[PDB]
Symmetry: C3
């Protein structure tokens, strides 16, 4: 018996997002569907297990959940739950649209309630401190809204999806300035550094959601978002030795959301015949990196 660390939801999140990326290649390359289905089944299975473990945590370790919830830093990871729930919904849609729709709405209402209760509460002051300014804040504030946007578009609710999209995009632009200034001034401690991987996510998750809503039209906004996304990738690549100064660890799954969304967006750029060479590199790169994450995770698992 142990309380499931909430961050572990990043594993099915990354796998689910990568399933969706491969799904979007099926009409260019049919074998991509089998790869998508396998990734989707594994992500869903891991999600079920982690959901049940989290239900156990709520039942028997409620004070740990309460403390994470009220923490001005640790609360953000709870947003992984409804995010992964929506992504699993998006996977399941290929097989059962009714069950998919239920999960998508549960995740959407859940993330919106979550932010509305906790993200706003921060504006009361005195609890959040300068040192609370962490990449994890992107999860409730930004990533959850993008995930809702694309999931609702999948269901046919394009205009409602644009509202969530806007909420996420503007929230992103409003938070990042203060995050990067904080990182410049204050050296994130090693135990939090893997969460630098979340810094990769905004531009790529943003363009993926946008392309999901706008029928895959690769337009000026999409190209703009990709450009900033690759800038951040190059920066994070340069920073990687510092990120893992104290060793490789499981927290590196933090990168998987950005990586998977880079792959997903790459499929749309390829479909649209925009920067196809860059698209192929992006898609291959993201898959290799997530493959390495899977292989390091199997290892850790075969070492208890």
């Amino acid at each position: 018996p142990f309380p499931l660390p909430t961050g572990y939801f990043g594993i099915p999140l990354g796998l689910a997002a990568l399933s969706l990326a491969w799904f979007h290649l099926e009409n260019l390359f049919p074998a991509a569907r089998m790869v998508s289905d396998v990734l989707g089944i594994v992500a869903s299975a891991v999600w079920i297990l982690f959901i049940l473990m989290y239900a156990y945590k709520l039942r028997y370790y409620f004070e740990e959940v309460r403390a994470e919830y009220h923490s001005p830093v640790r609360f953000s990871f709870i947003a992984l739950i409804p995010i992964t729930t929506m992504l699993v919904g998006d996977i399941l849609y290929r097989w059962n649209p009714l069950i998919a729709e239920v999960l998508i709405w549960i995740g959407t209402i859940g993330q919106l309630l979550f932010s509305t209760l906790r993200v706003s509460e921060l504006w009361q002051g005195g609890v959040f401190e300068q040192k609370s300014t962490h990449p994890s804040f992107y999860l409730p504030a930004v990533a959850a809204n993008f995930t809702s946007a694309s999931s609702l578009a999948l269901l046919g609710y394009h205009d409602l999806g644009y509202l969530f999209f806007g909420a996420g995009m503007i929230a992103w632009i409003i938070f990042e300035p203060v995050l990067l200034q904080h990182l410049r001034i204050s050296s994130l401690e090693p135990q939090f550094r893997a969460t630098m991987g979340i810094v990769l996510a905004p531009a790529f998750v943003c363009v993926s959601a946008y392309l999901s809503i706008n029928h895959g039209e690769v337009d000026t906004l999409a190209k703009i978002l990709w450009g900033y996304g690759f800038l951040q990738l190059f920066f994070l690549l340069r920073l990687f030795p510092w990120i893992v100064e104290k060793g490789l660890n499981i927290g590196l799954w933090a990168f998987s959301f950005g990586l998977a969304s880079m792959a997903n967006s790459a499929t749309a750029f390829y479909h649209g015949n925009v920067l196809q060479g860059v698209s192929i590199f992006a898609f291959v790169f993201s898959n290799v990196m997530i493959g390495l994450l899977v292989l390091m995770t199997i290892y850790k698992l075969t070492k208890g």
Copy 2:
């Protein structure tokens, strides 16, 4: 004899903006014109009175005006004067375009001169402090430019209106990051908390101005802005008990600008057959809230 607190201009501002919202419903529902005209006449009458009271303040309480002007916090409320002057111009345009145009230009030149003198002066440093980072800054920096944008569009100056629009939109995105970080860290004191209502304004005033310039075309930008606007609404609703911790007060008119612009934008979304259900809710909600403000103000007035 007393010096008129400059913040009181928020009352005719909210009423004038709400008049304009109803005005935009007239071709869907004719009776909306009577409601618009009544609101517009009351707003204009209150504006005349407050202008005369402010002329008296300048004549006999000039040092109080000087101190408010030089304050790195209190200067912002002076921007209410040219903002309300433009909105009254926009109302009067339905009856007398020549007088309307004069007021619109006086307000536009006045707000631009005001910002150019005072907002820039802050960049000299040493006067503005971290604790000066208040929602009121939106008034000179953001709301005034949006108001110019839409007023100039009304007069047929669409391209000039886009310049003001851009100034306001980029200024908004450049200020809000630091405002929300400050609110997270430092608990705004109760006496300033009603000004949290100004946080509702940017997205809604922005989309209202945009739709005024672009002939009511509800496009991707407009939907994006509405999404962030509703996020902030939900946050402020959650925060409302904290906002009024020390009691309901007249400062709550601070919400009326955002509310009225939510109503105005809702008329355009409805006209464009986008999210009509949300539009009706938004329009009804905003009217009820401003109706409550009017009823609390009549009360206060019937209690001296």
Copy 3:
């Protein structure tokens, strides 16, 4: 023998940018080509000389270069080198596209390597301080990417140009919030104040690059960018007496990038029949100001 202060690259930068502005008037007014060619030849000659002087610095004053590189403030000026190299490439393209393309790629790879190594390294914390938050940061972070964007578009690489464009535009919006808050709180010391001129650059360099990529189409984004650009101009004009409190100096070339890009963008607005009166004013204003910079520089040179 002396080590060339890296900031001096701002002189050929401003002249090169102004050459390109005049170049864009040639099909409206043929005599503009002669003016462009003369400015372009002078900028290129000054650039060659400064490059050779900088090669000498690297060879015989390497520790001075190393210290500037590692400084969390002074590193930014090194970005002037690849920026000016690209602009000289853009000039030379009218005579020799092959040599132009080589310079453009050297400058593009060089600026991207430079940022990737140094701008990201800041996020390790503990070196950059709040007082490091200076306008010069725009050079590597923002201006270099815009310059790449427009130079690559010149070569026909529009989509790749949009990636650089996005990187610069989003980087701009993400840095400026914290810069203006810092300037409000902390009074930039006189010796750095001329660099306030760099604050003029982002919106104008941004719209110039955008118009270069999008075939000169003056659209809503372009008008938006111009509006914020003129707001900042008016602010900087008001601030000018404070900027030069301790006297006029050669650092005022800092303004030339924004001024030249105001002129360049003005040619496109004029071509597109948008705000032609404003365009003429902008173009004339920018030329007069840069003419004054040239005349003060000849003076200083005729006084050793």
